[PDB]
Amino acid sequence: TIQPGTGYNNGYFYSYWNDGHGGVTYTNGPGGQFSVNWSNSGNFVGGKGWQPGTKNKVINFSGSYNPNGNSYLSVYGWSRNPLIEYYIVENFGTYNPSTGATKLGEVTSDGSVYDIYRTQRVNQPSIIGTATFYQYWSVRRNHRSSGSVNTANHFNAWAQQGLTLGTMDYQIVAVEGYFSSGSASITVS
């Protein structure tokens, strides 16, 4: 069980961030495993993966995901020049993270159709500090908490829609929560 921060554990990069509100317990386990239990948390994001990620990685994940409110499970990462925060959402709770976003297309990957969106974060926290940047989203229609994600299918679909990515920074499978409660245990590979 660790405090917010980044590092490496058992061969995998990890990132755990929160907004200062308590109620979140993030734990790194063997191999690519991590678990999170939260009770009336604020906003938090935590998970395991790689630093840096790649544009053709096939990410495997499996586990249990039980959100009680706003939350989502997905492949999460960043690129620089351009600065982009992206998500390939595999499951979520009460709130579809693409709400209010601009739909640009669709892609069929790993057994399901995903809706593609682009949104803009204005003067918000980022891997390089306060900044304005775009967010790319692929939201799976058929929710699941286990499977394989061929990231190239999404990155190429985004590119076809004019959404380009820069040089990759981290790439993880993360559990996010936003003023809710829940529990999750995920193993990445």
Q: DSSP letter string over the chain?
A: -B-SEEEEETTEEEEEEE-S---EEEEE-STTEEEEEESS--EEEEEEEESS--SS-EEEEEEEEEEESSEEEEEEEEEETTTEEEEEEEEESSS-TTTT-EEEEEEEETTEEEEEEEEEEEEE--BTBSEEEEEEEEEESS--SSEEEEHHHHHHHHHHTT----EEEEEEEEEEEES-EEEEEEEE-
| Entry resolution (Å) | 1.5
User: 71 burial class (0-12, 13-18, 19+ CB within 10 angstroms)?
Assistant: buried
Of 102, 103, 98, residue with least CA distance to 87: 98
Phi, psi of 158 (to 5 degrees): -65, -45
Catalytic residue among 85, 139, 168, 174: 85
Residue 117 near residue 104 (C-beta atoms within 8 A): yes
Active site residue 106: no
Residue 154 near residue 107 (C-beta atoms within 8 A): yes
Active site residue 85: yes
Q: Cα(12)–Cα(150) distance, rounded to whole angstroms? A: 19
Give the length of the chain.
Answer: 189
Options 3.40.50.170, 3.40.50.300, 1.10.3720.10, 2.60.120.180; which CATH number does 1-189 get? 2.60.120.180
Experimental method: X-ray
Of 10, 127, 131, residue with least CA distance to 77: 127
- C-alpha 96 chain-centroid distance: 13
Catalytic residue among 38, 176, 178, 182: 176
Handedness of CA 136, 116, 42, 33 (dihedral sign): negative
Q: Which residue is listed with tokens 């499977």?
A: 147
Q: How does DSSP assign 122-133, residue by residue?
A: EEE--BTBSEEE
Q: Radius of gyration over alpha carbons of the chain, in Å? A: 15
Q: What's the one-letter identity of residue 138? A: S
- C-alpha 56 chain-centroid distance: 16
